[PDB]
């Protein structure tokens, strides 16, 4: 419910001693958590809002020149002097133009000249900063209640929406009939907003690297500049022309909006118009399932016929969902649901919507289950009018293992060492793997920062070749592994 059909849906199964599980939430993904004797819940990070950001620097993308002035001095008499050179609104440059009797000078040679035009910014892009303590993550928690409309995720009306802030490490959501769920999220170890800028330019915003943003070759103003006219490196947006060493002119280069768009190729776009809400990045949380209980476990099984109102459908994740209308009496009853084999000798599938129940007779119910690979039968109801719905899955367990391995590898390529936090139960191997990943990721990020995916591919090919042509078996293997991982990261990057 609210998590089927996202295609970036992960299944966290089981909780450790203590009834907590580590889940990493991402924007555009959804996590569904299942544990013995506990309801299946759907979790989704649906908003990261940065509040009250302070502007760090203004950049000029579209300027103009006015009040152009020029002055010359006869050769070997020094430099020309312009009053306009006194204030920094005027962009100036000094140059030499040959002079003689024709111009008005008494001797021949290269006389100094200076051109000064007023510099005005017509359009600027503002880069803002936000403290890691001013973020407000929003998470929608959706129980698999089997409600009719629960499949439609976008609304999230009956899912509880909790706002996670760094002010309090613990967030408690009370799901009616299910108890409460406690989330201990870590907004501080997320996107590291101390090292990023919120660059907004003409009704579009980007989340950029702070050092990259401060390296931009455009005229800029300080974050707190009231006048708006003391632009720092104006020379990046004007060109001075002395073609034949006769006269000098200054012209304005042209609007840099398109060049800025090209420069922003690798950034993630964000929203800046109505609040600084940005839909990107992840959030590690700890899920406390202690106070979480199944709903309607005190009801009795339904004694009546069920009719299918929406045919069985296969989700993108190897699960099936089906909506069933109820027709018997005892309105608040439990739906008898099981995925058997053909002879009904034993149960093959695993219900994902644990404890389906029909609360109201008229209201249909959506049940999701995970059938096994091959042939399975979905039996629904008691024998008189019992529904037996055949299903085929078209897959293999080896194929599922490959898919899961590739999905975990991608998660490692995206979250780095935070991948080891996903569905972690605090195992010793998990800790050691995460620490080793931190070490190797720090080394790799040092060695591979700032390059493009093509450079990553080239470096990986070179390293693989060097490892292959290495006398040492140990060094050969290590170099080949490094090259293969680098090639994978180059293939899976720029996204």
């Amino acid at each position: 419910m609210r998590c089927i059909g996202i295609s970036n849906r992960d299944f966290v199964e089981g909780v450790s001693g203590g009834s907590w599980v580590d889940i990493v939430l991402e924007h555009g993904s959804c996590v569904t958590t299942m544990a013995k004797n506990k309801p299946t819940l759907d979790f989704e990070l649906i908003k990261t809002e940065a509040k009250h950001p302070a502007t760090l620097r203004k950049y000029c993308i579209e300027a103009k020149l006015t009040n152009t002035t020029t002055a010359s001095r006869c050769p070997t008499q020094g430099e020309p002097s312009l009053n306009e050179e006194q204030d920094k609104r005027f962009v100036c440059k000094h140059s030499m133009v040959d002079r003689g009797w024709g111009n008005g000078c008494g001797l021949f040679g290269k006389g100094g000249i200076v051109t000064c035009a007023m510099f005005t910014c017509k359009k600027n892009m503002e880069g803002k900063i936000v403290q890691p303590e001013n973020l407000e993550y929003t998470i929608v928690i959706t129980p698999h209640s089997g409600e009719e409309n629960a499949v439609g995720n976008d609304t999230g009306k009956h899912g509880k929406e909790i706002k996670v802030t760094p002010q309090s490490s613990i967030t408690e959501a009370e799901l009616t009939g299910y108890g409460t769920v406690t989330m201990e999220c870590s907004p501080r170890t997320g996107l590291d907003f101390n090292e990023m800028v919120l660059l907004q330019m003409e009704n579009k915003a980007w989340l950029v690297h702070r050092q990259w943003f401060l390296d931009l070759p455009l005229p800029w103003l300080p974050g707190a500049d009231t006048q708006g006219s003391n632009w720092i490196q104006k020379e990046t947006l004007v060109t001075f022309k002395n073609p034949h060493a006769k006269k000098q002119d200054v012209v304005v280069l042209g609007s840099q909006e398109g060049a800025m768009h090209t420069a922003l190729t690798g950034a993630t776009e964000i929203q800046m118009s109505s609040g600084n809400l940005l839909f990107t990045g992840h959030l590690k949380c700890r899920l406390r399932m202690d106070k979480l209980q199944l709903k309607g476990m005190s009801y009795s099984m339904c004694t009546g016929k069920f009719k299918v109102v929406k045919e069985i459908a296969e989700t993108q994740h190897g699960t099936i969902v089906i909506r069933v209308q109820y027709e018997g009496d005892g309105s608040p009853c439990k739906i008898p649901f099981e995925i058997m084999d053909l002879e009904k000798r034993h149960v093959l599938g695993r219900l994902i919507t644990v404890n389906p129940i029909v609360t109201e007779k008229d209201s249909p119910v959506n049940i999701e289950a995970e059938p096994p690979f091959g042939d399975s039968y979905i039996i629904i109801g008691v024998e008189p009018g019992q529904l037996k719905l055949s299903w085929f899955k078209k897959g293999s367990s080896i194929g599922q293992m490959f898919e899961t391995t590739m999905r975990g590898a991608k998660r490692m390529a995206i979250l780095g060492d935070t991948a080891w936090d996903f569905g972690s139960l605090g195992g010793v191997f998990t800790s050691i793997g995460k620490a080793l990943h931190q070490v190797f990721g720090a080394i790799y990020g040092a060695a591979f920062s700032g390059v493009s995916w093509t450079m990553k591919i080239l470096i990986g090919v070179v390293i693989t070749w060097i490892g292959m042509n290495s006398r040492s078996t140990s060094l050969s293997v290590s170099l080949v592994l490094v090259g293969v991982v680098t090639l994978y990261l180059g293939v899976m990057v720029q996204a």
Partner: antibody
Framework: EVQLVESGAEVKKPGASVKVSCKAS????????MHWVRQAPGQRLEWMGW????????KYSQKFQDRVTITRDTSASTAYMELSSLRSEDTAIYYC?????????????????????WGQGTLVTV | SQSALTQPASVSGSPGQSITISCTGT?????????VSWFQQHPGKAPKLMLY???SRPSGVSSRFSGSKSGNTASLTISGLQAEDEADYYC??????????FGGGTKLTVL
């Protein structure tokens, strides 16, 4: 209790323009897309377009794409629909149906339970 | 816009009987998706949503109103026709093109 209140009935000449409001109370006005449905007296309903109160984005039917404008007051919690270049054939009851946008604030796919709440209907004569 | 869904001009049925209403659309609005909703329009009153998602009905609507779909045609069924079921029934769809289309309008007469 979500009630959509519309402006009183109006009568205007063909060359005039009529602006009808639909005040929204009882739900978060900025999280719902305000639609406008026209029904001529004794005829079938007609969908004109919707305005995303959250971000002001609008859509129009090709029938009214040029002669219709929909605006919403986020602070006033009301959505406006003005129809210019009126005609006698333009006489009809104008309702304001409601639908909810997704959790990212954009109105891409309507909820299956769209138009669950309508206005009382505003009468326009020409 | 698009082409309005075509349903019978009027329908009548003896009280307590079962009467169905058709709603024919193309493969882009009714056949294509499940955005098929039925509205009940009493005279002088705003339309009321009776069915959505083809078969679903909003809270507070009698179970006598049931919906079904087949290919490019959507059918609205009422069980136990009553005296209250004397309004105009309009079928609407969300077209793949991103608009909404309403049926012509069937006027059900109890007797």
């Amino acid at each position: 209790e979500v009630q959509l209140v519309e402006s009183g009935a109006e009568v205007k000449k063909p060359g005039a323009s009529v602006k009808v409001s639909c005040k929204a109370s009882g739900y978060t006005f900025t999280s719902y897309a305000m639609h406008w449905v026209r029904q001529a007296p004794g005829q079938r309903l007609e969908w004109m377009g919707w305005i995303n109160a959250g971000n002001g984005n609008t859509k129009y039917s090709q029938k009214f794409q040029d002669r219709v404008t929909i605006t919403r007051d986020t602070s006033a919690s009301t959505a406006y629909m003005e129809l210019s270049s009126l005609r006698s054939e333009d006489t009809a009851i104008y309702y304001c149906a409601r639908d909810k946008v997704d959790d990212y604030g954009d109105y891409w796919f309507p909820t299956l339970w769209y138009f669950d709440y309508w206005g009382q209907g505003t009468l326009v004569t020409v | 816009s698009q082409s309005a869904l075509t349903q019978p001009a009027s329908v009548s049925g003896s009280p307590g009987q079962s009467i169905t209403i058709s709603c024919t659309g193309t493969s882009s609005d009714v056949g294509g998706f499940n955005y098929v909703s039925w509205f009940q329009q009493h005279p002088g009153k705003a339309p009321k949503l009776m069915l959505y998602d083809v078969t679903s009905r909003p809270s507070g609507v009698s179970s006598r109103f049931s919906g079904s779909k087949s290919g490019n045609t959507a059918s609205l069924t009422i069980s136990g026709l009553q005296a209250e079921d004397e309004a105009d029934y309009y079928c609407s769809s969300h077209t793949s093109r991103g608009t909404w289309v309403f049926g012509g309008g069937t006027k059900l007469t109890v007797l």
